[PDB]
């Protein structure tokens, strides 16, 4: 299948409570493989996946060094962003980052990512060309000018086409028994009366990996998007995910409804009914 590597970084200032916390979490698809938290008391005990341990201590040392420098860099960013928006030193603010690469089943680069949000709003992104920036406002234009002057996009491009793709391929090989295994959903339909007149049909999908899944209800073969309650896909804690979709149906009409399930681990899509 296709795969992604992505780092999700959060830097949050906290005036009067020390320096901004920096946490970076690395994923292959929906598997977290590394964390670096500036608030962790024991960086050595910070979790890494098993197929990371086999890479050895020099690999760990080089990553740890870059994470430590990234903590300082994101604190520099938060100081500058406060100034770009004329903000007081009293409030807490948040800078988020996502970066990494997507590859196809042959391991070739599909696209790269390097983008930022401030206080929950998109701020700047490296464009798909890996050469130009999109800035959201006049503050992000200041970042864009500085990064253009320093040729930052060329450094990001080299990481995204080189290091990111190369190490994602290595992780996929070392972790092939898990990272390259899609587990299909286990599916069933339940029935919950609400009155003499109506009942809920709930279509369940349990135990699947990766998290991407499509779950839909049809009535007489017509999609019921507006009338379907669809909960957010949620982690079970054993690597796998869960999701359900529910519709309210008139008593006696249950067999007109079909639940449809698509997922990478299924040889064929499922159609399910109550009973």
């Amino acid at each position: 299948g296709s795969h992604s590597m992505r780092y999700f970084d959060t830097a949050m200032s906290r005036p009067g409570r020390g320096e901004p916390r920096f946490i970076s979490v690395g994923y292959v698809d929906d598997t977290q493989f590394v964390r670096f938290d500036s608030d962790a008391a024991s960086p050595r005990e910070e979790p890494r996946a098993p197929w990371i341990e086999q890479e050895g201590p020099e690999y760990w040392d080089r990553n740890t060094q870059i994470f430590k420098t990234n903590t300082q860099t994101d604190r520099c960013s938060l100081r500058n962003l406060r100034g770009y928006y004329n903000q007081s030193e009293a409030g807490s603010h948040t800078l988020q980052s996502m970066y990494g690469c997507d590859v196809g089943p042959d391991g070739r680069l599909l696209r790269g990512h390097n983008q930022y949000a401030y206080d929950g709003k998109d701020y700047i992104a490296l464009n798909e060309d890996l050469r130009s920036w999109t800035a959201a406002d006049t503050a992000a234009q200041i970042t864009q000018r500085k990064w253009e002057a320093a040729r930052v996009a060329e450094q990001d491009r080299a990481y995204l086409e080189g290091t990111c793709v190369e190490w994602l391929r290595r992780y996929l090989e070392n972790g092939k028994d898990t990272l390259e295994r899609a587990d299909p959903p286990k599916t069933h339909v339940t029935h919950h009366p609400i009155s003499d007149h109506e009942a809920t049909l709930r279509c369940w999908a349990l135990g699947f990996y990766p998290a991407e899944i499509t779950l839909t209800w049809q009535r007489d073969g017509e999609d019921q998007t507006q009338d379907t309650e669809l909960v957010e896909t949620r982690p079970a804690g054993d690597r796998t995910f869960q999701k359900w979709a529910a519709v309210v149906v008139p008593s006696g009409e249950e067999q007109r409804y079909t639940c449809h399930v698509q997922h990478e681990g299924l040889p064929k899509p499922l159609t399910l009914r109550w009973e």
Binding site: N63, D74, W147
Partner: peptide
């Protein structure tokens, strides 16, 4: 593998 970041 982590990426070196740049100050905004």
């Amino acid at each position: 593998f982590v990426k070196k970041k740049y100050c905004l």
